[PDB]
Amino acid sequence: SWAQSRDEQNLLQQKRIWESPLLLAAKDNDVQALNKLLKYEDCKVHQRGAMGETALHIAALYDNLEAAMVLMEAAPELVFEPMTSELYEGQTALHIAVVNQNMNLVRALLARRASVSARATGTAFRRSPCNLIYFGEHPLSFAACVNSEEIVRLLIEHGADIRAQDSLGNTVLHILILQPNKTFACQMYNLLLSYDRHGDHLQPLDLVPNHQGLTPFKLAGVEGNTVMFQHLMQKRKHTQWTYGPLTSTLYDLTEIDSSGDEQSLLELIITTKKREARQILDQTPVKELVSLKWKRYGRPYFCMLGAIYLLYIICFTMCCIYRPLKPRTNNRTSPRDNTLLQQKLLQEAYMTPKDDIRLVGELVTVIGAIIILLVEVPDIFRMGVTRFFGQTILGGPFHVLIITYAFMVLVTMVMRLISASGEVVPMSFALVLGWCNVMYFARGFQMLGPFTIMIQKMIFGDLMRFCWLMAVVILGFASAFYIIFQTEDPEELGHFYDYPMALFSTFELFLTIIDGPANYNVDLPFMYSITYAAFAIIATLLMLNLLIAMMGDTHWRVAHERDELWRAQIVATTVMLERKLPRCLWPRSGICGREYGLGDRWFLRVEDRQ
Amino acid sequence: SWAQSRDEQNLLQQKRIWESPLLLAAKDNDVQALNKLLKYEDCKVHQRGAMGETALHIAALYDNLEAAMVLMEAAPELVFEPMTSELYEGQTALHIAVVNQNMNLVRALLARRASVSARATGTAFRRSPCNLIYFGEHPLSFAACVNSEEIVRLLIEHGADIRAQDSLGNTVLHILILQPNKTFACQMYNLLLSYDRHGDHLQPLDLVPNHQGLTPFKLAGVEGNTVMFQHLMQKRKHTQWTYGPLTSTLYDLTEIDSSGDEQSLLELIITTKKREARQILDQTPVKELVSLKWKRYGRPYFCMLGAIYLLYIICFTMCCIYRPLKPRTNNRTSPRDNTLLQQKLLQEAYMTPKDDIRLVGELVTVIGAIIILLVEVPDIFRMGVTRFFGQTILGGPFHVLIITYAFMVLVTMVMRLISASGEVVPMSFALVLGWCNVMYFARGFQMLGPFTIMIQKMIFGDLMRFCWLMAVVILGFASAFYIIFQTEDPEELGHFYDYPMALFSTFELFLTIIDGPANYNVDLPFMYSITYAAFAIIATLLMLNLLIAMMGDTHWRVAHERDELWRAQIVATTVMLERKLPRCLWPRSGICGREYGLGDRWFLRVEDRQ
Ligand SMILES: CCCCCCCC/C=C/CCCCCCCC(=O)O[C@@H](COC(=O)CCCCCCCCCCCCCCC)COP(=O)([O-])OCC[N+](C)(C)C
Ligand SMILES: CCCCCCCC/C=C/CCCCCCCC(=O)O[C@@H](COC(=O)CCCCCCCCCCCCCCC)COP(=O)([O-])OCC[N+](C)(C)C
Ligand SMILES: CCCCCCCC/C=C/CCCCCCCC(=O)O[C@@H](COC(=O)CCCCCCCCCCCCCCC)COP(=O)([O-])OCC[N+](C)(C)C
Ligand SMILES: CCCCCCCC/C=C/CCCCCCCC(=O)O[C@@H](COC(=O)CCCCCCCCCCCCCCC)COP(=O)([O-])OCC[N+](C)(C)C
Ligand SMILES: CCCCCCCC/C=C\CCCCCCCC(=O)O[C@@H](COC(=O)CCCCCCCCCCCCCCC)COP(=O)([O-])OCC[N+](C)(C)C
Ligand SMILES: CCCCCCCC/C=C\CCCCCCCC(=O)O[C@@H](COC(=O)CCCCCCCCCCCCCCC)COP(=O)([O-])OCC[N+](C)(C)C
Ligand SMILES: CCCCCCCC/C=C\CCCCCCCC(=O)O[C@@H](COC(=O)CCCCCCCCCCCCCCC)COP(=O)([O-])OCC[N+](C)(C)C
Ligand SMILES: CCCCCCCC/C=C\CCCCCCCC(=O)O[C@@H](COC(=O)CCCCCCCCCCCCCCC)COP(=O)([O-])OCC[N+](C)(C)C
Ligand SMILES: CC(C)CCC[C@@H](C)[C@H]1CC[C@H]2[C@@H]3CC=C4C[C@@H](OC(=O)CCC(=O)O)CC[C@]4(C)[C@H]3CC[C@]12C
Ligand SMILES: CC(C)CCC[C@@H](C)[C@H]1CC[C@H]2[C@@H]3CC=C4C[C@@H](OC(=O)CCC(=O)O)CC[C@]4(C)[C@H]3CC[C@]12C
Ligand SMILES: CC(C)CCC[C@@H](C)[C@H]1CC[C@H]2[C@@H]3CC=C4C[C@@H](OC(=O)CCC(=O)O)CC[C@]4(C)[C@H]3CC[C@]12C
Ligand SMILES: CC(C)CCC[C@@H](C)[C@H]1CC[C@H]2[C@@H]3CC=C4C[C@@H](OC(=O)CCC(=O)O)CC[C@]4(C)[C@H]3CC[C@]12C
Ligand SMILES: CC(C)CCC[C@@H](C)[C@H]1CC[C@H]2[C@@H]3CC=C4C[C@@H](OC(=O)CCC(=O)O)CC[C@]4(C)[C@H]3CC[C@]12C
Ligand SMILES: CC(C)CCC[C@@H](C)[C@H]1CC[C@H]2[C@@H]3CC=C4C[C@@H](OC(=O)CCC(=O)O)CC[C@]4(C)[C@H]3CC[C@]12C
């Protein structure tokens, strides 16, 4: 609906240029007709186009130097005119000649005092998925993104402000990081810092943030721009000595490490959705910083929490095993009734010293369930209650499973206080969610770490993508199997005696975890052998080994990038383990340079061999 | 804790150089300030640094030739000064200028009679995982490891001892093998043998061992340095004739083959932990030596021991089958009691001539169990009782299984002598350990050989790495399944009737080796169908085919290097079969050159075609 509208304006621009002889003579290189048109009476010079454009805009848009000079002589006030549309707001011909890199025509307008500070605020210039270029809003921003070193020098001599910000707060150094040609953006980055030295108006140009707060150093890590990230560490490192093939380099760790309350560079890479940002983790000062925090304070504090959680789940498991049960007080209803025991009442549950030992174990699992919710739930109140916490749901799925576990413990606490029947259903969820959260503590081991990335990408990328075709085949054949055996005696072959059982039987015959139905003492119905032969070929052979072959490719892809997926689990673990543990037991990383004559900041030394 | 300490000294070195004007003028190339400082009164010349360094140490460390010459004129006694720290003990500036390769400044110190024999015994020079360079302790050792042919010639002219040894006993030829650039180390190896000819003080420089006993020939094979190993066989081979495209080369086999009581080169490659050393086995005189020892005396003596072991295990199997059993004398306790027979007493066991035939077979399996322990156990007494024999445990795991088998035979010997109940548990271990040791004798066949390397790397690299996540899922769902059926009648569905059975049932439902529980005559509990549907998706589909896909990659990696893993099993078999068989039936390999005019050593001839 939006691409349909701006295709209708680009064809309407071409109709207006074919109707007006003034606009048509500016498209072609026709100075013969522009002499004849402009010598007429009043000429209709300031007429609009379909884009709100003037005739001097067309001459700069089609690289017509000779047509533009005729218009500037005959009408000198066309230079100060912006486009008055919606999709090209504020754009002048001084914007257009910069992008088309017409060196003779930029000097021509600036001789006629063209504005170097007009703001091209149209929707064909905002950072959008619909726009193929994001150049900024200023002509100095336009010339930097087209790699024109001659015009960037020529604009600053005429007064182009280098510290100007667009609607996103981005300076020209922020926009050069967002450009697709990364090697040419490094040379233009150096050139724009050569001119920023003049009596600093605030903190310098590479230290000015945008409306997100990011500096050009932190923006290169959020956007995954690894080429610019290496280029901006050269300002931040410092070589101490060089002993033959040795080199001792001292790195900054100011905007990388967690200085204060702001988000550090490690927090912004884990949070962001662009998965190109996780290549910053392989770059040198960040790579030895993560290994330093994990081997010193990360891994000891993580293996303590993993061992306290095992003793909690073993204490929870034995309270479910020794739960209060008594023989049933009523009598059996049907011959299909299998039940022999039922739950004791609350006053009846605690009446012996062995129930007092269990009550100690039940208070441990209730208090531990509250401590989980005191740590996890106040994060949804600080962050956004639905959306901005839902970003952490797709990031860490073990946040959900331990809040759901702690919910299930307090449900069967309430169902114990009031004497409620059916505590087996909140317990059974809590046993399997309680134990399968021990697979969270497998990222402390590099070999066991990305096994849970395999289990995740097989469920949410293979099973949740192919089970819609399996459920189609189960519903087809279970409905067939149900009406075949609908006229029969279930006491011989009872796999399909009602419709919910025929769906659970066909799910189990799909996966080949119960045997195929057979009696051999009675004549089975005729359609059964034909249907089950057709079922066993498409379900058990073909579609079951489809899924096993799909999951075998998910295994191969995760095991290939086995090292860089584990080291991104450690950054997410170390960052989480700082924002919840108190500061007195987490020392700050690196060597502080107060009593070494280096300032107030916190350095990190790397020694290598070339 | 150790890297944190020597980061604090490298920043403290930079503070002391910024405080003293004498040290700061030696870091920069400032001969203007060194003229003004040294013309003062007493100047504080011999002040220390944070590394125990002098001002003449800084000038050599930062490549300041002009700053160093001012210091040597004004203070000529700074040349004889070592660093008095702990981490740079004994290092002088004559060490530093050699590593930085400053040719003008090495001649300057040696003109002022600098010591060419000072020992840099600091912990930044010991062979350690923490040190990135191991250059030795002498300036001749430093110049050889930086590939400076001009300084090695210049040091020997001033009296550098070429036979000097560091704290590890390594000469300069030992250290050149330990260097990472292998091609440049070959040219420096040749240069240092050109100077060692002067009236040999002992056996020559390439034949002097270190405190481990290794010569530079044997050190290249232990360290896996295959480039230096080819370069040092050129001294050891000898071309007999060249008949067109043919060439007859006669190889040495002095330090390669088992000469006396010392460990040969074949014994040191199998023993060592660096698995780069097994590429020496593909090099020509070692490769045809292993094939010669195996095809002549290795494989006949190995197939005799494999056939005697089959007849021993078949004789052990029939003594377990015909074991003494009688009907039970007591009466049944419970309806769950299944037992119908029990063991006979010792006086009752041997009372017929068919028991006398078994007694012959039981003496064979007792005597054979003692002979295993007389061969295997006295190896743990000669080697280190815990640690240095534990190196052979990780090397050969079939040493453990045949000592454990021989232990299990003598347990049920003792349990037969005293009439002890429960001989089925030491026998059942001994049947499966007895028969699965026949897979030891599968390396005699090249096709069957590395099948047991597959079985090993799947157990100790896939199963012992993923079963911690399976046991989490088994304990989760077996605890869920136990409390679901805890209120039921076990006589219909008894898979989970107590907690140890529910763990063995869930282990068997994981692996899909028993069928899923179903009755269809009774109403099963409601949570069972939901839990077993969740179990059968994550356990049987997803996590069971994870492990099968992991083991499929272990198969692919071992089958790729199928030839070089079998030929390393033959070296370990041939070496083991020499140190236990007597010398009269193992002839020495090669042709001895006594009556061929070649000396006392033992050659091996290889004929090839180019
Ligand atoms: C990888 C590392 C390895 C892990 C290994 C770890 C150990 C793993 C194994 C552990 C034990 C396994 C065997 C024990 C079985 C006997 C229990 C018992 O006697 O039950 C009694 C009740 O007791 C209960 O009801 C249990 C309640 C929870 C116990 C915790 C109490 C407070 C601990 C506070 C702090 C907790 C932790 C704090 C968390 C921060 C009564 O039962 P019974 O009448 O005697 O029944 C006997 C039946 N039988 C005769 C057939 C047997
Ligand atoms: C990926 C997930 C998909 C799940 C797939 C499997 C679903 C599993 C869900 C299981 C939930 C079970 C809850 C309790 C069941 C009781 C009610 C019942 O269903 O049976 C009732 C029957 O009534 C029916 O026949 C309903 C089935 C209609 C067609 C199926 C539509 C399913 C939605 C399609 C979605 C499309 C998805 C794929 C397309 C994109 C009563 O059973 P009865 O006792 O035998 O009474 C017979 C009376 N008689 C004796 C007179 C004859
Ligand atoms: C790849 C190569 C292929 C391998 C092939 C090799 C051969 C493989 C097969 C071999 C034989 C298989 C069939 C034999 C079954 C009859 C045995 C018997 O009669 O038992 C008798 C007792 O005998 C015993 O108790 C056995 C004790 C050990 C025997 C060794 C005696 C001393 C040998 C010293 C040196 C040993 C070696 C030294 C080691 C260095 C009594 O039993 P029974 O009352 O008669 O029971 C009959 C029941 N039935 C009627 C139903 C049947
Ligand atoms: C890789 C290897 C791992 C193996 C995993 C599987 C272990 C296999 C080991 C099997 C050994 C079995 C030996 C004999 C069993 C008898 C005692 C018993 O356990 O049952 C007793 C129950 O008491 C319990 O419930 C204990 C279980 C507590 C929680 C499990 C902790 C396991 C350690 C976690 C380690 C974490 C490792 C993963 C995390 C990294 C008695 O049973 P009962 O007769 O039914 O009495 C019920 C009384 N009732 C009737 C009143 C209700
Ligand atoms: C699916 C579930 C499976 C996963 C298990 C989850 C359940 C249990 C969770 C976690 C396990 C808890 C028990 C520890 C056992 C392993 C420890 C170990 O050997 O690691 C290191 C020793 O440790 C260190 O060198 C540094 C840490 C200090 C010791 C840990 C402190 C507390 C230990 C307990 C005191 C508790 C205090 C409170 C008392 C209750 C060895 O070095 P590594 O380098 O780490 O070697 C392998 C990693 N690698 C592959 C990277 C090379
Ligand atoms: C009380 C018990 C229930 C409640 C407890 C908590 C339950 C919920 C737990 C965790 C929920 C936390 C969020 C989901 C986790 C990952 C989602 C994600 O990352 O994006 C995913 C899409 O997006 C989705 O698929 C969203 C999930 C929709 C279905 C949720 C129900 C599945 C329950 C689970 C039951 C499943 C049946 C298994 C057997 C039972 C993409 O996945 P990916 O990993 O980013 O990459 C894989 C794609 N790739 C392969 C192409 C590369
Ligand atoms: C999991 C278990 C499976 C493994 C079986 C373990 C159990 C039994 C253990 C070992 C097997 C014992 C029986 C021998 C059968 C095979 C012999 C053979 O054919 O090999 C060679 C013949 O042999 C030779 O050419 C040289 C050796 C002389 C013959 C062996 C002497 C003793 C034979 C018995 C007298 C006993 C004396 C004491 C009396 C008791 C053939 O040449 P090859 O080159 O080797 O061909 C294949 C190898 N390749 C792939 C490299 C090309
Ligand atoms: C009486 C009956 C019991 C006693 C009899 C004797 C029992 C003990 C027998 C042989 C023991 C001899 C030493 C182990 C052999 C190999 C170890 C090794 O090489 O290093 C290993 C690590 O290091 C370890 O894992 C050490 C082993 C720890 C567990 C030991 C108990 C397992 C028992 C066994 C039961 C398992 C369950 C199976 C079904 C039962 C590394 O393995 P790798 O091969 O070097 O390379 C593979 C890694 N790769 C794939 C990444 C490349
Ligand atoms: C009553 C007493 C004796 C028992 C103590 C209970 C502990 C076992 C609980 C209390 C708080 C719990 C912690 C609360 C929050 C978290 C964060 C949680 O983080 C995630 O799940 C990250 C998700 C992801 O990144 O995928 C991991 C478990 C952990 C450390 C919990 C581990 C278990 C703890 C220590
Ligand atoms: C009583 C019955 C009906 C309960 C049903 C249990 C399931 C709903 C639970 C139990 C096991 C759980 C799984 C166990 C482990 C994982 C791996 C876990 O992996 C990650 O989060 C990887 C990400 C990372 O670590 O980087 C994602 C959730 C998931 C699939 C869990 C999803 C929810 C599952 C299937
Ligand atoms: C495609 C691969 C997996 C195998 C290829 C062979 C199949 C197509 C063949 C092998 C056995 C055949 C079946 C053998 C016997 C029967 C039973 C017959 O039905 C009855 O006699 C019903 C019994 C009754 O009415 O009591 C119908 C054909 C059918 C299913 C045959 C269908 C074709 C089958 C499955
Ligand atoms: C009483 C009489 C009639 C029976 C003879 C008993 C033999 C069958 C036994 C006695 C000593 C045993 C040997 C003792 C030691 C070894 C070394 C052993 O070496 C390893 O296991 C290497 C381990 C590895 O490299 O993995 C292999 C079996 C072998 C030859 C044994 C094979 C079986 C032997 C010959
Ligand atoms: C009665 C029951 C409980 C006994 C249990 C038996 C297991 C503990 C045994 C029987 C089979 C054995 C395995 C059989 C064969 C091998 C291959 C073997 O492989 C090698 O040593 C390869 C190295 C090489 O040859 O180069 C290592 C031991 C291993 C895994 C064994 C380990 C111990 C196992 C699992
Ligand atoms: C993911 C792939 C492997 C298959 C995708 C389809 C499944 C998600 C569907 C197919 C059959 C369905 C089951 C069909 C019948 C039942 C029984 C129903 O429980 C009962 O009726 C219990 C019986 C009783 O209480 O007596 C609960 C839903 C459940 C487990 C369904 C859960 C969803 C299942 C497993």
Tab-separated table of C-alpha atoms in Angstrom, chain A residues 160-253:
chain	number	residue	atom	x	y	z
A	160	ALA	CA	29.335	22.983	6.770
A	161	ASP	CA	28.711	22.199	10.434
A	162	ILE	CA	30.439	18.931	11.324
A	163	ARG	CA	28.555	18.480	14.627
A	164	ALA	CA	25.044	18.668	13.139
A	165	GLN	CA	22.549	15.950	14.041
A	166	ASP	CA	19.538	14.573	12.175
A	167	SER	CA	16.185	13.517	13.659
A	168	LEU	CA	17.785	10.371	15.092
A	169	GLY	CA	20.538	12.410	16.773
A	170	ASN	CA	23.177	10.847	14.538
A	171	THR	CA	26.221	12.902	13.616
A	172	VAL	CA	28.179	12.241	10.427
A	173	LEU	CA	30.345	9.695	12.271
A	174	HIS	CA	27.262	7.687	13.288
A	175	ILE	CA	26.004	7.559	9.703
A	176	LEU	CA	29.328	6.316	8.273
A	177	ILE	CA	29.016	3.215	10.456
A	178	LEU	CA	25.605	2.462	8.936
A	179	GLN	CA	27.000	2.426	5.359
A	180	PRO	CA	27.426	-0.846	3.423
A	181	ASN	CA	30.967	-0.247	2.087
A	182	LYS	CA	32.977	-0.576	5.278
A	183	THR	CA	36.513	-0.065	3.953
A	184	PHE	CA	35.737	3.292	2.323
A	185	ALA	CA	33.940	4.438	5.479
A	186	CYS	CA	37.164	4.112	7.484
A	187	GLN	CA	39.001	6.663	5.338
A	188	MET	CA	36.129	9.142	5.547
A	189	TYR	CA	35.991	8.634	9.327
A	190	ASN	CA	39.634	9.728	9.665
A	191	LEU	CA	39.055	12.774	7.458
A	192	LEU	CA	36.147	14.069	9.548
A	193	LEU	CA	38.189	13.888	12.748
A	194	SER	CA	40.975	15.975	11.202
A	195	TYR	CA	38.581	18.943	11.137
A	196	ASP	CA	37.124	18.412	14.608
A	197	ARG	CA	39.757	19.938	16.873
A	198	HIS	CA	38.491	23.518	17.120
A	199	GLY	CA	38.044	24.419	20.823
A	200	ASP	CA	35.660	21.598	21.822
A	201	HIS	CA	32.054	22.765	22.259
A	202	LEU	CA	31.289	19.705	24.394
A	203	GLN	CA	32.842	16.226	24.574
A	204	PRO	CA	34.447	15.498	21.138
A	205	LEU	CA	32.705	14.358	17.977
A	206	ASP	CA	33.440	10.648	18.428
A	207	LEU	CA	32.068	10.896	21.986
A	208	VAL	CA	28.722	12.605	21.250
A	209	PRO	CA	25.732	10.245	21.631
A	210	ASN	CA	22.470	10.021	19.697
A	211	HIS	CA	18.906	9.779	21.031
A	212	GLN	CA	19.565	6.114	21.821
A	213	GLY	CA	22.651	7.056	23.849
A	214	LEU	CA	25.125	5.265	21.612
A	215	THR	CA	28.465	6.813	20.689
A	216	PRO	CA	30.117	5.856	17.354
A	217	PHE	CA	32.186	3.319	19.300
A	218	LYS	CA	29.139	1.610	20.800
A	219	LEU	CA	27.151	1.887	17.562
A	220	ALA	CA	29.728	-0.185	15.671
A	221	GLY	CA	29.210	-3.065	18.108
A	222	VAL	CA	25.417	-2.957	18.124
A	223	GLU	CA	25.337	-2.888	14.317
A	224	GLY	CA	27.916	-5.676	14.016
A	225	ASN	CA	30.280	-3.432	12.043
A	226	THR	CA	33.464	-5.370	12.832
A	227	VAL	CA	35.617	-3.452	10.336
A	228	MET	CA	34.918	-0.084	11.998
A	229	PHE	CA	35.229	-1.695	15.447
A	230	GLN	CA	38.849	-2.679	14.781
A	231	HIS	CA	39.551	0.795	13.385
A	232	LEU	CA	38.282	2.556	16.523
A	233	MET	CA	40.307	0.455	18.984
A	234	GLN	CA	43.517	2.047	17.672
A	235	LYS	CA	42.599	5.187	19.613
A	236	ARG	CA	41.985	3.004	22.682
A	237	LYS	CA	45.062	0.763	22.857
A	238	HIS	CA	48.598	1.601	23.967
A	239	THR	CA	51.791	-0.389	23.342
A	240	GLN	CA	53.987	-0.613	26.441
A	241	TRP	CA	57.116	-2.376	25.162
A	242	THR	CA	58.347	-4.543	22.284
A	243	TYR	CA	60.829	-7.281	23.252
A	244	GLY	CA	61.821	-8.878	19.975
A	245	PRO	CA	58.796	-10.857	18.824
A	246	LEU	CA	56.847	-9.819	21.928
A	247	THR	CA	54.498	-6.859	22.329
A	248	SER	CA	52.680	-5.660	25.455
A	249	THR	CA	49.531	-3.716	24.574
A	250	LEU	CA	47.359	-1.968	27.167
A	251	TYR	CA	43.668	-1.723	26.216
A	252	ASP	CA	41.152	0.852	27.373
A	253	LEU	CA	38.032	-0.942	28.752
